[PDB]
Design an enzyme around this catalytic site. Structure first.
Site, PDB file in Angstrom:
ATOM      1  N   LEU A   1       0.834  -1.192   0.000  1.00  0.00           N
ATOM      2  CA  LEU A   1       0.000   0.000   0.000  1.00  0.00           C
ATOM      3  C   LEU A   1       0.862   1.232   0.000  1.00  0.00           C
ATOM      4  CD1 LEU A   1      -2.328  -2.102   1.136  1.00  0.00           C
ATOM      5  CD2 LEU A   1      -3.512   0.060   0.821  1.00  0.00           C
TER       6      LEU A   1
ATOM      7  N   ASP B   1      -3.438  -5.777  17.858  1.00  0.00           N
ATOM      8  CA  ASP B   1      -2.374  -4.773  17.946  1.00  0.00           C
ATOM      9  C   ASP B   1      -2.523  -3.672  16.934  1.00  0.00           C
ATOM     10  OD1 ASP B   1      -0.117  -3.534  19.019  1.00  0.00           O
ATOM     11  OD2 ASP B   1       1.284  -4.629  17.718  1.00  0.00           O
TER      12      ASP B   1
ATOM     13  N   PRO C   1      -1.726   3.081  14.255  1.00  0.00           N
ATOM     14  CA  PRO C   1      -1.633   3.786  12.966  1.00  0.00           C
ATOM     15  C   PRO C   1      -0.583   3.214  12.014  1.00  0.00           C
ATOM     16  CG  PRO C   1      -2.193   5.337  14.713  1.00  0.00           C
ATOM     17  CD  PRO C   1      -1.789   4.025  15.393  1.00  0.00           C
TER      18      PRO C   1
HETATM   19  C1  LIG Z   1       7.450  -1.620   9.638  1.00  0.00           C
HETATM   20  O1  LIG Z   1       6.712  -1.952   8.570  1.00  0.00           O
HETATM   21  C2  LIG Z   1       5.330  -2.296   8.582  1.00  0.00           C
HETATM   22  C3  LIG Z   1       4.514  -2.329   9.829  1.00  0.00           C
HETATM   23  C4  LIG Z   1       3.079  -2.696   9.777  1.00  0.00           C
HETATM   24  C5  LIG Z   1       2.477  -3.019   8.502  1.00  0.00           C
HETATM   25  C6  LIG Z   1       3.260  -2.995   7.250  1.00  0.00           C
HETATM   26  C7  LIG Z   1       2.584  -3.344   5.956  1.00  0.00           C
HETATM   27  O2  LIG Z   1       1.819  -4.439   5.868  1.00  0.00           O
HETATM   28  C8  LIG Z   1       2.728  -2.471   4.735  1.00  0.00           C
HETATM   29  S1  LIG Z   1       3.660  -1.071   4.763  1.00  0.00           S
HETATM   30  C9  LIG Z   1       3.248  -0.763   3.122  1.00  0.00           C
HETATM   31  N1  LIG Z   1       3.678   0.335   2.376  1.00  0.00           N
HETATM   32  C10 LIG Z   1       4.258   1.535   2.829  1.00  0.00           C
HETATM   33  C11 LIG Z   1       4.638   2.533   1.816  1.00  0.00           C
HETATM   34  C12 LIG Z   1       5.247   3.778   2.211  1.00  0.00           C
HETATM   35  C13 LIG Z   1       5.504   4.088   3.637  1.00  0.00           C
HETATM   36  C14 LIG Z   1       5.136   3.125   4.675  1.00  0.00           C
HETATM   37  C15 LIG Z   1       4.530   1.879   4.291  1.00  0.00           C
HETATM   38  N2  LIG Z   1       2.439  -1.703   2.580  1.00  0.00           N
HETATM   39  C16 LIG Z   1       2.145  -2.674   3.492  1.00  0.00           C
HETATM   40  N3  LIG Z   1       1.342  -3.727   3.205  1.00  0.00           N
HETATM   41  C17 LIG Z   1       4.703  -2.627   7.311  1.00  0.00           C
END
Ligand SMILES: COc1cccc(C(=O)c2sc(Nc3ccccc3)nc2N)c1
Length: 282
Positions: free
Chosen positions: A75, A119, A122
């Protein structure tokens, strides 16, 4: 690696490092999470069969060379960064309402399938340019289980209750809702006891009247200070009465009295919900 190309480290997750990666075969970018049990493999694998517009899709569970990787759809940005980016003017109310509505839909779906998150924060709420918001990491807590953020932890968890219920996710979403509105964390505890007392100072120290069974919880102590409840109108000022009434129902002490995601979707607060486009800086 063998089937992936690490574009970047997007951060530290609950169970390990998470990278933005590209599948060599398909060229698709994903969020690859390295996990830091054979029952866990079975449970997690069941999660791949969870499809809903407000749930980040778990594309694959990869168990190779005795390492565990979870592959998730990628995402655009997380709500934490979006809130920080929107701190000068605040996220518009219509967009806050749309996000809360969608998140409740995601929770109603997971919960109807007997899957809890446990859990929500944000950091694991992800948004896209089209106005959607999705929950990531549902069901991992149960499958796996144990500086961690305590800000969104429900009181029953802080009081050492060992049996979680769908209510813990509603509490966390309630805390997130408040934070979007006021542009400040509702309960920013720095420790378990500080987290708990911050809740008590705002919502009042719980007792058997509002929370039958609370005084018998594992970590409850008769010596907790007794703080009076603060008026809700002071907690999230810019929110109208429908929003405050919904929030109050999401923050009931007793998990059993706390509103369900399904019932929350029917709350009057959502009578005029729409789906605005957010201004995302990527
Ligand atoms: C420490 O990292 C995490 C912590 C909790 C959830 C996720 C996660 O599932 C994500 S982050 C992501 N894109 C993203 C693009 C730009 C900035 C931050 C995240 N896309 C997915 N699906 C990653």
């Amino acid at each position: 690696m063998e089937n992936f190309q690490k574009v970047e480290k997007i951060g530290e997750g609950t169970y390990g490092v998470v990278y933005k990666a590209r599948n060599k075969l398909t060229g698709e970018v994903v969020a690859l999470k390295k996990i830091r049990p054979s029952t866990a493999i079975r449970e997690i694998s069941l999660l791949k069969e969870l499809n809903h517009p407000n749930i980040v899709k778990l594309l694959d569970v990869i168990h190779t060379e005795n390492k565990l990787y979870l592959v998730f759809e990628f995402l655009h940005q997380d709500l934490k960064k979006f809130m920080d980016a929107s701190a000068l003017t605040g996220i518009p109310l219509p967009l806050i309402k749309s996000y809360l509505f969608q998140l409740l839909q995601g929770l109603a779906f997971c919960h109807s399938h007997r899957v809890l998150h446990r859990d929500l924060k944000p950091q694991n709420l992800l948004i896209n340019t089209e106005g959607a918001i999705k929950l990531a990491d549902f069901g991992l807590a149960r499958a796996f289980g144990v500086v961690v953020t305590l800000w969104y932890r429900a009181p029953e968890i802080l009081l050492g209750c060992k049996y979680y219920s769908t209510a813990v996710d509603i509490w966390s979403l309630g805390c997130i809702f408040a934070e979007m509105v006021t542009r400040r964390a509702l309960f920013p505890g720095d420790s378990e006891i500080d987290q708990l007392f911050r809740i008590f100072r705002t919502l009042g120290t719980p007792d058997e009247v509002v929370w039958p069974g609370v005084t018998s919880m594992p970590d409850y102590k008769p010596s907790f200070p007794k703080w009076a409840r603060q008026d809700f109108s002071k907690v999230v000022p810019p929110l109208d009465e429908d929003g405050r009434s919904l929030l109050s129902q999401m923050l009931h002490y007793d998990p059993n009295k706390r509103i369900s995601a399904k019932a929350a979707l029917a709350h009057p607060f959502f009578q005029d919900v729409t789906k605005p486009v957010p201004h995302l800086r990527l």
